[PDB]
Each structure stands twice: as structure tokens, then as C-alpha cells.
Specification:
homodimer; alpha+beta; Umud Fragment, subunit A; 2 domains; 9-stranded mixed β-sheet; two-stranded antiparallel ribbon; 3 helices; about 30% strand; sequence-specific DNA binding (chain A); repressor (chain A); LexA-like (chain A)
Chain lengths: ~200, ~120
């Protein structure tokens, strides 16, 4: 749009932080992670971002930052994911494609590149672009995008008490059993379609 | 966008327009065809999928093509040898189709360059 290289870094940090915690970072957190001389330096960049209209500064109150112009055209394509980083971290986005989100039901929020042949039998191949609807409200038998201790995977869900079995659709593969008592597990979304190009 | 200009047979005997960048495919897609049947299931082309097609006559052995044999459009893997055209499925339950160019009408409609599955 019109951001300098450094403003872009501050802006990316803000979005990543919101995507991972649900709230903006403080001026101190920004200064620390980006190696700025002080909180005053971070404030200046925030002022310029507010000026460019990408955020709104709610004076007073800690973490008083709001993102604007969220409504965007197309769909971002998520490539590889890194450990300790939200699925939709800016570093993971390899582009935005002009595809009607409403072609899918529920509507697609993002595209994710599939790795491996685990879901071959239902037509999802290595390298396919999976259309995903962001939600945690899912049910047994649905194909979901889940994260197991930082590893992301696409499998059919089968809840089993304190465990979760992630079923593949390929005879060469076996189920992945997740013990909720000792592993981090989160649902990133619901698969709603596929684009192979 | 891409027009859905019809159906294509894949082991089973304009109706729309979609807002999908034709440049997402290479070569570029010219139109979409609705797939019928599971003849190409082994390479991920399923019944009901929208097959993105690039209009061209220049295809080669091994490629997935859209062909018309006596006015019936099908999608299969091509294997040509002189006057012998073999249209192979990607499903071990299906039989390959052999076409003799001296006896039957045969035209390549296009090259498959992608798929869209939206349920």
C-alpha cells in the first residue's frame, strides 16, 4: 500500500501478535522484539501506521491498538508453518489469490498447501491447495486442519475421550493418536474444498 | 472468471460462471467442465469436481486430456501410437479405451490443467 520497510515490520508484528494471542502488543513488546532504542521509537512507527490508516490508536488504556481495513479480496495462501508461530503469520503467507470465497460452503477464509498423500482416497493430493473455513466448532467425521505440538496436519476427526484419533484416507497410513493430557492440540479449521493447479 | 460450459465423462454416462483467476493455472484455463464418474480417482479427479481446461490441440502421451469420441466428451490419460489411440483411466476397475483414427471421429478438446472441488 505505502509502508516503509520498517513500518511493515512493525505492522507484521502487530498482526502476528493478534493472530496468536487475540490482542495487540504493547509499545515495550514492539521495541524489545524489533530492537528499538525505546518505547518512544515504537510509538512513532505506530503513529505513522495510524496515519496510513492500517490501524486505529485508542489513546490511553494498554494495548490500545485496532486494525482497520480488514475486509480483503481473494484468499491468502498459507505455505509452510513454523513452530511457535500462528498459522496465519505473515511470514507463512505466500500470496493472495483471486478466488470467490463464497464458492465454498462454509466460506473459505484461507488456502493451505497440503503436504503428503495421507488423504489420497478422498481426492486430496500432495501439493493441493486446501480451502479452509476458520473455526473450532467441528464434529466427528469431518476433515479438519489440526495442530499437534506445532505440527499441522489434515485428517478426519475421531474424538476418543481424553484422546483424539486423526484418521487418514490412505491404506499405507495409520491413525495419529493424540493424548490431550500431554500434548498441545488445537483445531485450526474445517476443510471446505480443494484447488489443484 | 471461468465459464462452466458443460459436463465431461469420466466413467459415467453454459451452466455457470466462476470468479476464479484463470492465471492460477498453467497454461491458463479457458473453461471448466463438470466431471462425472470415478474413472480418474487415482490421481485425485473425483465425481462432481470442476475440471479446469486449456483449449489446445497440442498434447502428448501421459497428459490428462479432454477428448471427444463420436460426440461424447471424456477425460482420460492419452497414449497415442500412429493410428492407435489409447485412452487410459486412473482407476484399476476401468478398462482402457482404444480408438482407431481411420474408423472413428476423434478430436482433442483440451488439456486438463487443474481442479476445483467445492462440494
Amino acid at each position: 500500500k505505502a509502508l516503509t520497510a520498517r513500518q511493515q515490520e512493525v505492522f507484521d508484528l502487530i498482526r502476528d501478535h493478534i493472530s496468536q494471542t487475540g490482542m495487540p502488543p504493547t509499545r515495550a513488546e514492539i521495541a524489545q522484539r524489533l530492537g528499538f532504542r525505546s518505547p518512544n521509537a515504537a510509538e512513532e512507527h505506530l503513529k505513522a501506521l495510524a496515519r496510513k490508516g492500517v490501524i486505529e490508536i485508542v489513546s490511553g488504556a494498554s494495548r490500545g491498538i485496532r486494525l482497520l481495513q480488514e475486509e480483503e479480496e481473494g484468499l491468502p495462501l498459507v505455505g509452510r508453518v513454523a513452530a511457535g508461530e500462528p498459522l496465519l503469520a505473515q511470514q507463512h503467507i505466500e500470496g493472495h489469490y483471486q478466488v470467490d470465497p463464497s464458492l465454498f460452503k462454509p466460506n473459505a477464509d484461507f488456502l493451505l498447501r497440503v503436504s503428503g498423500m495421507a488423504m489420497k482416497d478422498i481426492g486430496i493430493m500432495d501439493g493441493d491447495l486446501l480451502a479452509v473455513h476458520k473455526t473450532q466448532d467441528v464434529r466427528n467425521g469431518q476433515v479438519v486442519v489440526a495442530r499437534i505440538d506445532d505440527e499441522v496436519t489434515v485428517k478426519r476427526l475421531k474424538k476418543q475421550g481424553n484422546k483424539v484419533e486423526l484418521l487418514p484416507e490412505n491404506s499405507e497410513f495409520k491413525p495419529i493418536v493424540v493424548d490431550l493430557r500431554q500434548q498441545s492440540f488445537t483445531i485450526e479449521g474445517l476443510a471446505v474444498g480443494v484447488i489443484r493447479n
